[PDB]
Each structure stands twice: as C-alpha cells, then as structure tokens.
Amino acid sequence: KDTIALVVSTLNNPFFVSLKDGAQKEADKLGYNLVVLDSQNNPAKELANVQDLTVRGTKILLINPTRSDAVGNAVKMANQANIPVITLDRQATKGEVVSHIASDNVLGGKIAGDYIAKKAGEGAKVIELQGIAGTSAARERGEGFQQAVAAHKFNVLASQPADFDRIKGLNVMQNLLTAHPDVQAVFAQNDEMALGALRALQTAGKSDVMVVGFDGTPDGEKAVNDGKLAATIAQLPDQIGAKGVETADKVLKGEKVQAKYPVDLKLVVKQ
C-alpha cells in the first residue's frame, strides 16, 4: 500500500484526535497506509516532522499547522522536495499548497439561518450580530446567513457588529431590543456574542427569542444544554481529516483538484 503522511499540530485535544481518526478511517477505506506525526504544538517539532518526511520520500503531505504564520518554512521544504502539500483547518500563510480543507463558514451561517426558519418560520423578524469587520469568519458567516435570508425571505430588523465579544454582544443586543421588541430570532456569528445577547434578552424578560450561535465552544454547548441557546454550529474534525485523505487520493492519482474543499458543520441542539 502507498503511504499518506499527516502532520498534526497536536494530539493533546479531542478535536485533533478526531481529525487523526477521520483521516485514518478514510485511509483504511481507500487502501492507504497513514503515517501520523504529532507536532506537539511546537513549530520546531513541526518543521522537523516535515523534514523527516522529505528525507523518506513521502508522496503526499497532509498538514494541520501549529499556527498559520509558523508553518511556511516547513511547507517550502516539502515544495522543494516536490511533495504536494494539502493543508487542514488552518492555512499556510506562505508556501505553495495544492489544496486547503476546512470547515465551510458560509455553509455554517446558512445552516444557522435554516434552523431559524425551521423554528421561527418563513419570513421571521431577525437580528444578526456580526463579528470583527474584515475577518474571513465574519464575512463568510454573514454571507451564509444572507443566503438564508434570501431563501427564507427573513425580515432583517438590524445587523450590527459586536466584534465576536460577549460584552459587546450584550450591549448591542440590549440596544437593538429597545428599537425592535418584536424580534423573533437572533443569529450571532460566534458563541460569545450569542451568550451576551442571551443575557440581554434574559434581563429584558424575553426568553421567547430564539438565538443561534456559532463555534460549539464549551460555554455555547452549556447554553444549549441549559435550554437558553437554541443552537450552536460545531466543526466536524473527523470529516476534515477524511476530506484531506480523499483529496490526497485524487492528487496522488494525478487528478487536478480544487484549491479549497469545504467541510460540513453540524447543528448542535438540546438533547
């Protein structure tokens, strides 16, 4: 069997273990042998991992960077050895990458909007709490949410940035509540902003307003479990790993692949 190499940022966290497990599972399915090197969250260890792989003549490199800005030299070493690079979750600031695989933020915003339409119905009155202006997260999530607005003809009462921060989310929500008391649902572009908004609604005595967050952070999860937050959107690490291998399979075969492959996210509701 041919070998696919995965350099993972770390293995000290469940998210990264799942990524490795999904890669492994897809490797087994497609008949490949998977080499896994743990960078231990250290950029020096990451560089040495790639170097180690280049001396052995690995055919493809799947790399989940420790930090986007730290990985460039490791990527260029792979480029110099003619070893195709595929990045997972975080991009490489520098270096040539054949394909990048990550959670689709546009799809995520759309999912959040589809869920608002599911529970609050077509044409609902909504408020969007946006993230830091200029970030890819705020832009993509807002883009996905706009698709939902167009698909479900939502009445967007307001859309204001709260810069991915809890306190600003609360203040902005409190402000917009005085202006639009008939708001039916809120799409907050991160869990922190969703939690701030929930506090504002709680203080105002409005528990009927359906709030959807994004990230699936422990606190966002907690808000869902406690029955306060309607939903949050979580990344699927196993599938990033899987899509990575699937794309590596195509690259190894000589197929011309896309620069980016979107990975689904899942809705997280109370159980």
Curated annotation (Swiss-Prot):
Main location: periplasm
CDD domains for the chain: PBP1_ribose_binding
Location(s), subcellular: Periplasm
Keyword Cell wall biogenesis/degradation: no
Keywords: Chemotaxis, Periplasm, Signal, Sugar transport, Transport
InterPro entries: Peripla_BP_I, SBP_2_dom
UniProt entry tagged with the keyword Transport: yes
Example GO BP: transmembrane transport
An example Gene Ontology CC term for this record: ATP-binding cassette (ABC) transporter complex, substrate-binding subunit-containing
Entry similarity comment: Belongs to the bacterial solute-binding protein 2 family.
Annotated protein name in UniProt: Ribose import binding protein RbsB
Lineage: Bacteria, Pseudomonadati, Pseudomonadota, Gammaproteobacteria, Enterobacterales
Gene designation: rbsB
